[PDB]
């Protein structure tokens, strides 16, 4: 139960992975919408779980933060740098056409499959190590993925809001600024200018 003392919704019995009874707006009242929401929630969770380290790790290294790493495309002759290497295809129209064709193909492949249970957990080629072996352990891994991904989503929100509250920052730069003086470096200064 997400909120002790609160009656769980009628349609949330706790059986689903990551189902703690949280839908205060009753957005899953219709079952079709709820299933679609489980799929989409997992998609966001996995994009976030991939994108958070892609945001943090290049910052720990000498490379720019996640904001600076997008900046060459604003200027016309822009060329990307992967690990300091001016990659030749780094021009914006190149990687842009590449990204459109590749992403569009893959994601549209997800659009043209309706199991619907495979739209959440397809497996097969995407489970070569076969972690779907024990359905108990596979379901516990479902709770694992859902909580990890929700955590990553919250973290991403923290990164975007910190970026708005300190334009041209880094999550770890913000963290270090806090570690300097935690009692005088806080969200309190942003909430209260």
């Amino acid at each position: 139960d997400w909120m002790p003392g609160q009656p769980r919704p009628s349609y949330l019995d706790g059986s689903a992975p990551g189902d703690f009874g949280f839908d205060p707006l009753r957005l899953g009242e219709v079952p079709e919408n709820l299933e679609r929401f489980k799929e989409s929630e997992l998609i966001h969770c996995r994009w976030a779980m991939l994108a958070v380290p892609g945001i943090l790790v290049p910052e720990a290294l000498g490379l720019g933060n996640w904001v600076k790493a997008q900046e060459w495309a604003a200027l016309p002759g822009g060329q990307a740098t992967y690990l300091g290497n001016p990659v030749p295809w780094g021009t914006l129209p190149t990687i842009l056409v590449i990204e459109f064709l590749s992403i569009a193909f893959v994601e549209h492949q997800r659009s043209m499959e309706k199991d619907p249970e495979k739209k959440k957990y397809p497996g097969g080629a995407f489970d070569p190590l076969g972690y779907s072996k024990d359905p108990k352990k596979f379901h516990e891994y479902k709770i694992k993925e859902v909580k990890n991904g929700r955590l990553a989503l919250l973290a991403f929100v923290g990164i975007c809001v910190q970026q708005s509250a300190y334009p041209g920052t880094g999550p770890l730069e913000n963290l270090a600024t806090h570690l300097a003086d935690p009692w005088h470096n806080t969200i309190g200064n942003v909430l209260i200018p």
Binding site: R26, E29, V30
Partner: protein
């Protein structure tokens, strides 16, 4: 049938004079004619559309002919800022010699009227230069009028009359209207701009004879197909440029400068060509949305069926709306009139702020006349839109086929809608009137510092958002660090920011508390007019006082004196009531516009700024003050050219007042009076040798509402037109 009107046997059998009147007022209501069918309905409408188009072409042809044959056009082109244009000549055998003298002006041989329609600036801007060009135009339009009559006649004979199924093919008509009627027409117009109008702007006279020899651009066609279009934006006209000349002339045919031409004070012709080209592309690509004969496209019905929110807060959503609208010509006319009224006001608001015609912004009588013109047109069009919403609810609306969709739910909670429009109108009315009256009392007691003057800080903040510096809010486009400012610095922003911060033009005029108050009066008028019309449409099928109203039709006198009294209970009566409020609202709008500009044009902006915050200021410093030249158009000491506006000014005052008769006196009084008159005629020797063929009766109840509203409106419009034109043109500034 058996006599006029042949379309109504019930009217032809009327022995009274009513038969004639109602024969006229019902001639176009085809659905009420005897033996009407759907096919006859659609076919009569279609032919009527061709007839209208023919009227429009013939009218513009007449304007062209008269400017060419009696006007100043050729002389006006050489000196746009010192030649009064000529509408047409005056041949009136009632003129005394002083009228012949005083109306002879504009450098003409006899009395003439100065045109305030602004067709000289338009035709000059689009490339017309000689009276010969105008004659070619007029004959071309007379030709088009004739072919309109020809097609309308043609589609009334069988095998040329279309089936109703063809009229109800909505997807095809939308594809052709978007892609062809909107898109291709706009594209061709861009053609005329780059081939004729822009050359004429650079000194080149391009006509049908030589337009194949001349290139529109030195490199043209080739940079278009290569995909390097910027070569067309390359060499624009110089900021020092003379419009009829090659001085400062560039070669660019498509630009996005953003401001005005410094000489003509109007939009850049290359800007306008680029505009019509781009929106033409948008209409072309957008006109491929719906499905016809090729196995691709949308079923509008299916899209409407699909847009039903889960959770059911809109019930069944938009299901059944495709047939509800496609089967109801009144629904279609309502949507068309609503949209057309919005964009008519939009035209009014954008043509005074962003003038598109050379040397039109300096002609102040024309700018005022056009703004007033289009705002009143827009008002009437809006009232009509709601009228046909109501007529839809009565004649075409099928409750079972719209069950629990959004449209039926409008009726289902009509009391919340009507009651909240009533609340908004009461709040706006109480407080706008209250603040005006407070300020008037303060100025009466000599304490202007006690007024309630609220800064229109939200609109001011929007003007700052546009880059106006008058208020120092330092927001986007008004601020240096704004991404919105950086993104457009290289394109339109230099010309735009240049134009908005020029103090002479009407581009986002500076606003103060006087503008706050009138804007809230305008809000009041929109809300009250809308309240009347919406209540009329939603109560057209019935109320608690008349639950069976749908069975009585759109227009009926009333339901008798029972149940408390029921006068003006029909939907038509709600329209009739709302027209008064529309005339009031557009009166406030146009008073506002004309006073703000007439003070701007005099360099005396302060007079508006200080005097518009109390109503005596409007009465004394606007109407009373600017009637001075008008009311002296003729007097015991002589006449001048303003006499026609003085006369008309009273004419309106008369017609308006005559309307009051039909609106205050009701029928029974006149019916008894006419009975005494019938007795008088029959008992008078020599005269009783003459007998009436139609029994004289008093006008109908509804008929009197209409006749009185028409007098009220004609007097309204003619009065304000006389004052507007005389007060501006008399000063010309």
């Amino acid at each position: 049938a058996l006599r006029f009107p042949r379309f109504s046997q019930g009217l032809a059998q009327d022995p009274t004079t009513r038969r004639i009147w109602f024969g006229i007022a019902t001639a176009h209501d085809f659905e009420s004619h005897d033996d009407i069918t759907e096919g006859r309905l659609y076919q009569n409408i279609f032919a009527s559309h061709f007839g209208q188009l023919a009227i429009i072409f013939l009218w513009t042809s007449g304007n062209l002919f008269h400017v060419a044959w009696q006007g100043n056009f050729e002389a006006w082109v050489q000196d746009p800022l010192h030649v009064r244009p000529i509408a047409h000549a005056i041949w009136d055998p009632h003129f005394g010699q002083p009228a012949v003298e005083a109306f002879t002006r504009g450098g003409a041989l006899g009395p003439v009227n100065i045109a305030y329609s602004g067709v000289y600036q338009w035709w000059y801007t689009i490339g017309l230069r000689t009276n010969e060009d105008l004659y070619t135009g007029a004959i071309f339009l007379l030709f088009l009028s004739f072919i309109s009559l020809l097609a309308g006649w043609l589609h009334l004979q069988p095998k040329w009359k279309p089936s109703v199924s063809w009229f109800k093919n909505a997807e095809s008509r939308l594809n052709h209207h978007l892609s062809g009627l909107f898109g291709v027409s706009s594209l061709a117009w861009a053609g005329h701009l780059v081939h004729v109008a822009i050359p004429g702007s650079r000194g080149e006279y391009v006509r049908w004879n030589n337009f194949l020899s001349v290139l529109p651009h030195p490199q043209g066609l080739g940079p278009l197909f290569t995909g390097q279009w910027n070569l067309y934006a390359q060499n624009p006209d110089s900021s020092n440029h003379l419009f009829s000349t090659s001085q400062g002339a560039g070669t660019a045919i498509l630009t996005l400068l953003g401001g005005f031409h410094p000489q003509t004070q109007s939009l850049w012709l290359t800007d306008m060509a680029h505009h019509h080209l781009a929106i033409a592309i948008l209409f072309l690509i957008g006109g491929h949305m719906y499905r016809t004969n090729f196995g691709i496209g949308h079923s509008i019905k299916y899209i409407l069926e699909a847009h039903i929110p889960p959770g059911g807060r809109l019930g069944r959503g938009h299901k059944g709306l495709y047939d509800t609208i496609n089967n109801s010509i009144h629904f279609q006319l309502g949507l068309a009139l609503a949209s057309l009224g919005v964009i008519t006001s939009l035209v009014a608001q954008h043509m005074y702020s962003l003038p598109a015609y050379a040397f039109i912004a300096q002609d102040f009588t024309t700018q005022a006349a056009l703004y007033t013109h289009h705002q009143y047109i827009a008002g009437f069009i809006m009232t009509g839109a709601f009228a046909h919403g109501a007529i839809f609810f009565i004649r075409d609306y099928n409750p079972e086929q719209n069950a629990d969709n959004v449209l039926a739910r409008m009726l289902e909670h009509k009391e919340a809608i009507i009651s909240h429009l009533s609340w908004a109108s009461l709040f706006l009315g109480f407080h706008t009137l209250g603040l005006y009256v407070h300020n008037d009392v303060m100025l009466a007691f000599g304490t202007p510092e006690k007024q309630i003057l609220i800064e229109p800080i939200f609109a001011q903040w929007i003007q700052s958002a546009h880059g106006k510096t008058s208020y120092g809010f330092d927001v986007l486009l008004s601020s240096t660090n704004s991404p919105a400012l950086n993104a457009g610095r290289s394109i339109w922003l230099p010309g735009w920011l240049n134009a908005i911060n020029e103090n002479s033009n009407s581009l986002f005029l500076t606003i103060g508390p006087g503008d706050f108050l009138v804007h809230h009066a305008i809000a009041l008028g929109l809300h009250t007019t809308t309240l009347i019309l919406v209540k009329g449409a939603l109560d057209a099928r019935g109320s608690k006082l008349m639950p069976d109203k749908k069975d009585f039709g759109y227009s009926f006198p009333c339901d008798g004196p029972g149940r408390g009294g029921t006068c003006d209970i029909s939907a038509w009566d709600a329209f009739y009531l709302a027209v008064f409020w529309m005339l009031n609202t557009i009166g406030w709008v146009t008073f506002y516009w004309h006073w703000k500009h007439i003070t701007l044009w005099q360099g005396n902006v302060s007079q508006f700024n200080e005097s518009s915050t109390y109503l005596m200021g409007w009465l004394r410093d606007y109407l009373w003050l600017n009637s001075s030249q008008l009311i002296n158009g003729y007097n015991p000491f002589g006449m001048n050219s303003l006499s026609v506006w003085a006369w008309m000014f009273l004419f309106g005052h008369l017609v308006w007042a005559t309307g009051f008769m039909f609106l205050i006196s009701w029928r029974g009084y006149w019916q008894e009076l006419i009975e005494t008159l019938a007795w008088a005629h029959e008992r008078t020797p020599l005269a009783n040798l003459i007998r009436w063929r139609d029994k004289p009766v008093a006008l109908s109840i509804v008929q009197a509402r209409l006749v009185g509203l028409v007098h009220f409106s004609v007097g309204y419009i003619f009065t304000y037109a006389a004052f507007l034109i005389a007060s501006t043109s008399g000063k010309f500034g």
